């Protein structure tokens, strides 16, 4: 464990969990109608958390390695390292 | 499932934020048309291996950054993508031993 | 359904009146007058509650529309809870594996 | 360019639960009226055990011969 | 319709019969019982008319009649529950509207170009 990859996996799962939690909160609890303020605060907090999780996932994606360093570049470097 | 209450909802909040988390982001990396086995097909050479060993290569040997600080794969990167006090902490990519 | 209740009420009334007319010569006449007025109270209560029914027979169709409305809104509430439920079953079962 | 798996959202305002369902369902004037018939029927009659038996029969669901066989004295 | 007036005349005849048999009438009071039997016959004719009418009534009408109120109160309560469910559903949809607006605001803050292209596509 303790990799950027497991962090990215846990961030994506936390995004899906925040989706299900946001709908289950904001449909189960609400002020009735007119033809409350805690619920509005809950909505603001949930929107902020989802946005933060999205930004974090994007940053971790930027952080991992590129589509350079293909497997042959790893293998030839491994060969040179065995010789040295 | 049946009921969510102030304290339990706030517990969900702190747990989700502790799992997840002026710019200080990584320097953006473009697309890469030269890749070594498939794309550019370099016959095994020597400049590429010397670059992968000694120099700074920002897609291969590390993650670069704004404010200049270089981080290779075994280090942990501290950043702040938001305008808050909360800091993202990217863990090391390799974790040797 | 009120036709069946009307027929059954008329049948039970006529049968109880037949039992009363059978015991009418049998019963002691002075107290039989009291039993007759008790039975008349029974029939008056049956008929006034039927009168309340046939009064409400104008208001039947609005309650039918109200039942339609209530069923529809209960269905949409079950749709909301089902969406949240399937998202939870996505986020905790399929993605963990 | 396009995001993955975009599709068409439904018709802009079809039948929802966000409309006023009663006014659309022509039931407004009955509510505006509405917002005992024992007493409203005791406008006609005297007042409003065996009436419990009347309600229990509700919860459960030869006329000349009767007049001839109804023999009983006065006093 | 006509069953109401027929059973009403029957009930009034029953009340007059109870009043007369409550009295010590030396004359013929068997006419009261004969009118009661004729009212039962007319109620059988009204039962034929109820086979013509075919009314369907829920049981809670019978039970509120047992409580001795108006069934108009049951109409009021069905209307009130209809408006209660409509209020609750409109409120849930309104909170979803506010939440969608907040989410697109915050994502437009954090992801400019993507929410720009989304507001373009809609």
Radius of gyration of chain C (CA): 28
Rounded Cα distance, C10 and A46, in Å: 65
| Structure-determination approach | cryo-EM
Q: Output the 3-class SS for chain E.
A: CHHHHHHHHHHHHHHHHHHHHHCCCCCCCHHHHHHHHHHHHHHHHHHHHHHHHCCCCCHHHHHHHHCCCCCHHHHHHHHHHHHHHHHHHHHHHHHHHHHHHHHHHHHHHHCHHHHHHHHHHC
Q: From CA C20, how far away is CA E36, in angstroms rounded?
A: 13
CB contact under 8 Å between A27 and E92, yes or no, is yes
Minimum-distance CB partner of E99 among A26, A34, A58: A26
Place of tokens 């407004």: D28
Q: Are strands B77-79 and B88-90 parallel, antiparallel or unpaired?
A: antiparallel
Instruction: Of B16, E115, B5, E109, give the one whose Cα is nearest residue A46.
Output: B16
Q: How far is B40 from chain A (nearest CA, A)?
A: 10
Cα separation, A4 vs A24, in Å, equals 30
Helix H, strand E, coil C: the string for C1-40 is CHHHHHHHHHHHHHHHHHHHHHHCCCCCHHHHHHHHHHHH
- B72 beta partners: B62
Neighbours of C (≥3 Cβ pairs closer than 8 A)?
A, D, E
Residue C48's closest chain E neighbor by CA?
E11
State this model's resolution in angstroms: 3.5
Interface contact flag, B17 A49, Cβ < 8 Å:
yes
Q: Count the neighbouring beta carbons within 10 Å of the beta carbon of residue E13.
A: 16
Q: Report yes or no: E69 at the C interface, CB cutoff 8 Å.
A: no
Chains in contact with chain A (at least 3 beta-carbon pairs closer than 8 A): B, C, E
Question: How many angstroms separate the Cα of B81 from the Cα of each of A48, A52, B84, E116?
Answer: 14, 9, 8, 20
Contact call for residues B65 and B71 (beta carbons, < 8 A): yes
Q: Give the distance from residue C60's alpha carbon to the nearest chain A alpha carbon, in angstroms.
A: 26
- Find residue B63's DSSP bridge partners: B71
- Quote the CA–CA distance of E81 and E93 in Å, as a whole number: 18
Tokens of B39: 């794309």
């Amino acid at each position: 464990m303790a990799d950027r990859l497991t962090q990215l996996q846990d961030a994506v799962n936390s995004l899906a969990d925040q989706f299900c939690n946001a709908i289950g909160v904001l449909q189960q609890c609400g002020p009735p109608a007119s033809f409350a303020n805690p619920t509005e605060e809950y909505a603001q907090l949930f929107a902020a958390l989802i946005a933060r999780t999205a930004k974090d996932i994007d940053v971790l994606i930027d952080s991992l390695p590129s589509e350079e360093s293909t497997a042959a570049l790893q293998a030839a470097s491994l060969y040179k390292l065995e010789e040295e | 499932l049946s009921r969510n209450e102030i304290i339990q909802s706030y517990l969900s909040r702190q747990s989700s934020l502790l799992s997840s988390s002026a710019r200080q982001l990584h320097v953006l990396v473009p697309q890469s048309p030269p890749t070594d086995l498939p794309g550019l097909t370099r016959e095994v050479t020597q400049d590429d291996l010397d670059r992968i060993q000694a120099s700074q290569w920002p897609g291969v040997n590390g993650c670069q950054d704004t404010q200049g600080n270089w981080y290779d794969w075994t280090q942990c990167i501290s950043l702040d993508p938001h305008g808050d006090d909360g800091r993202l902490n990217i863990l090391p990519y390799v974790c040797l031993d | 359904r009120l036709s069946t209740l009307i027929e059954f009420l008329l049948h039970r009334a006529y049968s109880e009146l037949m039992v009363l007319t059978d015991l009418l010569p049998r019963k002691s006449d002075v107290e039989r007058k009291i039993e007759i007025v008790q039975f008349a109270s029974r029939t008056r209560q049956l008929f006034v509650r039927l009168l309340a029914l046939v009064k409400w027979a104008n208001n039947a169709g609005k309650v039918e529309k109200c039942a339609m409305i209530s069923s529809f809104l209960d269905q949409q509430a079950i749709l909301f809870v089902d969406t949240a439920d399937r998202l939870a079953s996505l986020a905790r079962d399929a993605l963990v594996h | 360019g396009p995001f993955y798996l975009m599709r068409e959202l439904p018709g802009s305002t079809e039948l929802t639960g966000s409309t006023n369902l009663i006014t659309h369902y022509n039931l407004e004037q009955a509510y505006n009226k509405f917002c005992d018939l024992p007493g409203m029927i005791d406008l006609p009659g005297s007042h409003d055990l065996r009436s419990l038996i009347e309600k229990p029969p509700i919860l459960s669901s030869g006329t000349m011969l009767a007049g001839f066989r109804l023999h009983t004295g006065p006093l | 319709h006509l069953e109401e007036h027929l059973e009403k005349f029957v009930e009034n005849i029953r009340q007059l019969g109870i009043i007369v048999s409550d009295f010590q009438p030396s004359s013929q009071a068997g006419l009261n019982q004969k009118l009661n039997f004729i009212v039962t016959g007319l109620q059988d004719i009204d039962k034929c008319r109820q086979q013509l009418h075919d009314i369907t009534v829920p049981l809670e009408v019978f039970e509120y009649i047992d409580q001795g109120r108006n069934p108009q109160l049951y109409t009021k309560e069905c209307l009130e529950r209809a408006l209660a469910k409509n209020e609750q559903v409109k409120g849930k949809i309104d909170t979803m509207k506010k939440f969608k607006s907040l989410l697109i605001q915050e994502l437009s803050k954090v992801f400019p170009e993507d929410m720009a292209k989304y507001r373009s596509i809609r």
